[PDB]
């Protein structure tokens, strides 16, 4: 029925074209202002999640427990001009090996660097800011240090610390050899057990670890260690601007102090947390030109190779077409107000230019074919073309349409935000195809009838060879074949399909030759810890009875499987349960603290206020009784009614390190009737972590110790849980259910397509079943591709995919509309009419995308470009145009009905 329309339509566009491009050039412009208007795009790294995640909630209450995580600024380093040098202990006998950047030169050097960095100034605002201006001290205003995990703070940063030698000028009994070779044994010690009572702390960024300051040793033999490590955490607010780019500011001065550092004795390898974002941006900037230039060999071929009498302006205006299909839908969606990602820059374009291009050559090479009968006047000529290929036209673009705005239905936000522009940007494109373009047909082919100059204003060479083409290769000589090789190629794929990778290499998504390769190949060639991760028990628990800490505390008095009991013995195999260390304990310390015995806690006689541990005063007695019932974990009340004197006294020689120190922030203390301890951590380290996969075990299994001590735990219902978080949960969490994801998007395609391209075709259930199957053969194969070219299967490539199939949708629907609807006496004759007829033009909107699917890997040298969308591009123009264009029409002269 709808021939009716679409004749009396081409009529009435033939008539009168003023009304018809004026008025789809006010919805072009009308649409259009919405692109000027709102223009918003996306580029927080939060692209890779949806809101209301498991990771991205999660993040959202550690970010009400310690806030955010801090953005870390770090430094490997290594000395390549020095060799080992051993230190020969005086009087004990044994030896101990220094490794080459332990030579004390070495190290006196590092610090002149340290104290480079420590003092840094960086204009924001027109002001001034240093390092102390955005690091992370935890005490405040009490010693304001900047937290600097270094080796040299071991000896405080200081060279008269580091240059102490205990012995007469003849012999050493202790120099630097010695008091390294004590903290690294237990680095919260503030006395040396023979250095002149050296400590082992810093300036106070914490109890120094020797896995987060050194690396490439062996066995906890640190005294081997052939690279230190400087990292200078920095405070990282989320919800604030102004500190964040005054931070950012110093980051980029600190990254430019380090590109220019003149040291022939180091070798060094850097890190601001702001180093991946800005080498993305400038990695996404070689190619441009490269793109630009691909559009520019594609519009060429449009404007010249469509039929000095030729169809330049015509191809000119198709295009213009296209780009204002493109222009109304991202007008019109960011009017309602919706974020652009670049992924969607990218495949939008491609696809809109695909598809109209092809139903552009579609009707164009549907007149030129097409011989006029006496009195047809151009109504009757051009309304009769545009009812006879309009039926094909609208059956493709709209099948494609309903399956990308469909495929908007899924979680992940890439697929999301594209299949929507996608969705709206090819059904304004068919309209503007149907409409307007019609009427700007009808008008070259006036000009061309009155002979003036149609660049200054019978079937060609084509048609003749597809006719030739038809008959050889659908004969029933290689009818068998045909099945043959696309069934064997099909069922390799299939192989090779559970085979296939996932995740992004974080090497290869980086400009290789940037300063950031160095610094993955040295973290994986040295470092032996990685990224934090904090336990969080959720607020609710109890904490003040014996039963309660029994189910937290860990070591002595407490339960087989509680909290940090089970992080420990997790621990131990740290090389499957992704967990490096041991838990910092709060409650622990804390029980270590109010002993009776160490005299760290004293409250005065009546005014109970906690006396600093270096007082003097006689009216501060025990905290706790020395009575057998006092010299007890503070059960009840007594437990509220120390540990905020603990979360504030401040490191004391004659003590230990204080809770102000590291856990004053790891523990938040609710004063309601009136005090209670909900929402506390116990924070850890994550092994190596040098892959995507392992990043997702990592994930997994972190996340399974969580359910697993929860499950231990005697949870009332289920208020609060024990979850794990780290920075990079919520970006590798998409992985952690990609496959169902990925099935599911494609599948609900596969369903669009079959329904509409089975509606559309008179509801011929074996049209579709042969078509739509023939496309998953498509995207099977395509995985195969995705195989041997060794592409994964992140978000992006998702994407590729879904839009592939959509694309897949414009060779096959054509071809078999065009078997379906025929009066021919044969299957294979009705092959070959579907094929020389719509085959010629198909392979018009496959030429285009290819010689610009070639330029593409010409200029472009960006990895991500070449192998993901260069070669994604190519397989699917390759493979969608060998599946309907020789495959199809084989599976049709099969099954094809009559
Ligand atoms: C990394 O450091 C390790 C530190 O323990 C080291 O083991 C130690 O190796 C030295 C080698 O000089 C042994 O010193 C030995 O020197 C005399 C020289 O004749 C030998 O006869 C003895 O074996 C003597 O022990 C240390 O004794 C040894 N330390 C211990 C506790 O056994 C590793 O060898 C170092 N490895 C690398 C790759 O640097
Ligand atoms: C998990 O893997 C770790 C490395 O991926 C591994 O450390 C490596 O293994 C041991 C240290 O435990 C050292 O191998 C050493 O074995 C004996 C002592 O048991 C000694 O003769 C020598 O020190 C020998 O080299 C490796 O040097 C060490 N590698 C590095 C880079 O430090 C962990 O031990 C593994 N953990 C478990 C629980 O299996
Ligand atoms: C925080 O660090 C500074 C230096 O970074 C410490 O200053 C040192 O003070 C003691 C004197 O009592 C000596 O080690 C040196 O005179 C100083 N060292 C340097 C490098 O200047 C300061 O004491 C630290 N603050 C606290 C509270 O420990
Ligand atoms: C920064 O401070 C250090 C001492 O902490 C000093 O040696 C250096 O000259 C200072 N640099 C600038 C640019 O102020
Ligand atoms: C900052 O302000 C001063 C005077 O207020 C001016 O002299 C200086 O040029 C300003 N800084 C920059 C970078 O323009
Ligand atoms: C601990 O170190 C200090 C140095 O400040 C020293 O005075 C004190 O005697 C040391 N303690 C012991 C028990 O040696
Ligand atoms: C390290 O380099 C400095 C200057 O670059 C030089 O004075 C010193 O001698 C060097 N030390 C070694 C061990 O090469
Ligand atoms: C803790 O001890 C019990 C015995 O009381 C034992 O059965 C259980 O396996 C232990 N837990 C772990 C994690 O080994
Ligand atoms: C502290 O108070 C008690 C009250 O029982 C008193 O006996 C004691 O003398 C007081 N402390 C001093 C140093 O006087
Ligand atoms: C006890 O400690 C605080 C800070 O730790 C310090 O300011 C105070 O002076 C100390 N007490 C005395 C009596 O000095
Ligand atoms: C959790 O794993 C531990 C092994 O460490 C085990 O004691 C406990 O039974 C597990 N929880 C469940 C619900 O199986």
């Given at each position: 029925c709808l021939r009716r329309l679409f004749t009396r339509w081409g009529s009435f566009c033939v008539r009168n074209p003023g009304c018809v491009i004026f008025f789809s050039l006010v919805f072009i412009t009308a649409c259009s202002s919405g692109l000027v208007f709102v223009r918003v795009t996306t580029n927080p790294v939060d692209l890779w999640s949806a809101p209301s995640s498991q990771a991205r909630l999660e993040k959202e209450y550690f970010d009400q427990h310690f806030g955010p995580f801090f953005r870390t600024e770090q430094l490997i380093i290594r000395a390549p001009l020095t060799d080992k040098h051993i230190y020969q202990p005086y009087p004990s006998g044994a030896d101990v090996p220094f490794g080459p950047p332990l030579d004390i030169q070495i190290l006196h050097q590092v610090l002149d660097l340290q104290i480079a960095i420590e003092n840094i100034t960086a204009s924001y605002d027109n002001e001034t800011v240093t390092l102390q201006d955005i690091c992370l001290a935890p005490l405040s205003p009490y010693n304001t240090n900047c937290t600097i995990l270094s080796v040299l703070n071991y000896f405080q940063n200081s060279h008269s610390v580091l240059d102490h030698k205990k012995g007469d000028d003849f012999f050493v009994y202790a120099d630097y050899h010695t008091h390294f070779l004590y903290c690294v044994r237990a680095?919260?010690?503030?006395?040396?057990?023979?250095?002149?009572?050296?400590?082992?702390?810093?300036?106070?960024?914490?109890?120094?670890?020797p896995w987060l300051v050194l690396g490439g040793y062996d066995d906890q033999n640190?005294?081997?260690?052939?690279a230190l490590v400087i990292t200078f955490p920095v405070n990282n607010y989320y919800n604030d601007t102004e500190k964040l780019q005054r931070a950012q500011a110093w980051e980029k001065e600190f990254i430019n102090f380090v590109k220019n550092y003149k040291n022939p004795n180091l070798t060094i390898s850097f890190t601001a947390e702001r180093s991946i974002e800005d080498e993305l941006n400038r990695e996404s900037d070689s190619d441009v030109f490269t793109v630009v230039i691909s559009y520019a060999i594609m519009f060429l071929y449009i404007s010249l190779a469509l039929g000095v009498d030729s169809k330049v302006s015509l191809g000119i205006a198709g295009i213009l077409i296209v780009l204002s299909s493109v222009a109304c839908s991202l007008g019109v969606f960011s009017y309602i107000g919706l974020p652009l990602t670049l992924i969607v820059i990218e495949v939008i374009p491609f696809l809109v230019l695909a598809v109209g291009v092809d139903n552009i050559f579609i009707l164009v090479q549907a007149y030129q074919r097409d011989e006029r009968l006496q009195g047809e006047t151009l109504d009757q000529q051009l309304g009769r073309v545009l009812g006879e290929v309009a039926p094909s036209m609208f059956l493709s673009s709209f099948s494609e349409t309903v399956a990308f705005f469909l495929g908007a239905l899924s979680v992940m936000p890439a697929v999301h935000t594209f299949s929507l522009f996608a969705g709206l940007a090819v059904f304004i494109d068919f309209l503007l195809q149907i409409t307007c373009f019609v009427s700007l047909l009808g008008l070259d082919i006036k000009r061309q009838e009155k002979n003036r100059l149609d660049i200054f204003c019978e079937s060609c060479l084509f048609r003749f060879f597809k006719n030739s083409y038809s008959p050889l290769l659908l004969k029933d000589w290689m009818r068998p074949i045909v099945i043959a090789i696309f069934v064997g190629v099909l069922s390799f794929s299939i192989a090779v399909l559970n085979k296939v990778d996932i995740g992004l290499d974080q090497s290869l998504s980086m400009p290789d030759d940037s300063y950031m390769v160095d610094y993955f190949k040295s973290i994986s060639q040295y470092l032996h810890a990685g990224p934090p991760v904090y336990f969080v028990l959720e607020e609710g628990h109890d904490y003040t009875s014996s039963k309660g800490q029994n189910m937290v505390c860990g070591g002595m008095?407490?339960?087989?499987?509680?909290l940090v009991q089970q992080i420990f013995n997790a621990a131990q195999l740290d090389n499957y349960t992704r967990i490096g260390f041991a838990p910092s304990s709060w409650i622990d310390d804390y029980f270590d603290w109010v002993k009776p015995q160490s005299s760290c806690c004293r409250v005065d006689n009546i005014t109970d206020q906690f006396c600093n541990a270096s007082v003097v005063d006689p009216a501060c007695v025990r905290c706790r009784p020395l009575t057998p019932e006092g010299k007890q974990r503070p059960q009840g009340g007594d437990f509220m009614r120390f540990l905020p004197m603990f979360l504030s006294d401040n490191p004391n020689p004659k003590c230990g390190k204080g809770g102000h120190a590291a856990y004053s922030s790891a523990v938040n203390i609710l004063l309601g009737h009136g005090t209670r301890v909900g929402a506390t951590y116990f924070m850890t380290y994550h092994t190596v972590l040098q892959t995507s996969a392992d990043f997702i075990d990592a994930l997994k299994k972190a996340r399974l110790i969580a359910s697993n001590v929860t499950e231990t735990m005697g949870i009332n219902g289920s208020a609060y849980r024990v979850f794990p978080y780290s920075v990079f949960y919520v970006f590798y969490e998409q992985y952690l259910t990609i496959i169902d994801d990925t099935i599911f998007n494609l599948g609900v395609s596969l369903g669009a397509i079959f329904l509409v391209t089975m509606v559309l075709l008179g509801c011929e259930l074996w049209s579709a079943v042969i078509m739509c199957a023939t496309i998953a053969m498509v995207l099977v194969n395509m995985f195969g591709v995705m195989w041997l070219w060794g592409i994964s299967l992140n978000a992006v490539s998702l994407v590729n995919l879904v839009m592939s199939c959509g694309i897949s949708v414009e060779f096959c629907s054509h071809i078999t509309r065009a078997f379906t609807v025929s009066m021919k006496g044969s299957r294979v004759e009705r092959a070959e009419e579907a094929l020389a007829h719509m085959g010629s033009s198909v392979f018009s909107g496959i030429t285009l995308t290819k010689f610009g699917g070639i330029v593409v890997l010409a200029f472009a040298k960006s990895q991500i470009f070449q192998i993901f969308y260069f070669r994604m591009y190519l397989a699917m123009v390759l493979l969608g145009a060998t599946h309907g264009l020789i495959f199809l029409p084989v599976l049709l002269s099969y099954i094809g009905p009559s």
């Open positions: 680095p919260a010690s503030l006395n040396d057990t023979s250095l002149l009572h050296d400590p082992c702390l810093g300036t106070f960024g914490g109890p120094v670890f640190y005294n081997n260690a052939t008095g407490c339960n087989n499987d509680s």
